[PDB]
Ligand binder design. Sequence first.
Ligand SMILES: CC[C@@]1(O)CCN(c2ccc(F)cn2)C1
Length: 185
Amino acid sequence: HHHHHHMVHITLDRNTANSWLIISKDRRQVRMGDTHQNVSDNKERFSNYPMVLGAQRFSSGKMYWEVDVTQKEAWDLGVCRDSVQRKGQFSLSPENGFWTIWLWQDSYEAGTSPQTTLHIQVPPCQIGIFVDYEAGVVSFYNITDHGSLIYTFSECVFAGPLRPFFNVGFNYSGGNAAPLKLCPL
Ligand SMILES: CC[C@@]1(O)CCN(c2ccc(F)cn2)C1
């Protein structure tokens, strides 16, 4: 791909974070804490899962960013509607306003309903996310493998403003404490 020149500076929105997350001072890194992080509850926070949104809202144009997933066992990445459900249980699907891929139990899958098997020969340490709002496209690129395509959602019904979406995953195993990091342009 040649999408790097629509690069946008993404930062994380503390107010949307699950109350166990720790966001860095620069708002470019997030990890799971070993406890509640001593913040008040609010209607924006994802309650059930270790999720957080980007601060940026997009309703037009082409946007690209990169995320470091080094030494994680589990994570979700992509974009979602600004109006997604925050509280209780839900599935990551375009019907619920999410365009995502994930790693879980040594397999990579796209968040369709039901989920789609991905075929990645080189396990990625960094993921590129490309959104074309007018075209209705969300694409995922393997930066570790010369930018090779991972998955494309097309004919997307965004149905409102979009926000960058992140899930650092649980750490039941003690093997998933590593952060998600937004990579420099
Ligand atoms: C274990 C120390 C941390 O809590 C802080 C930094 N960290 C990692 C782990 C892996 C990796 F690739 C990058 N950062 C997790």
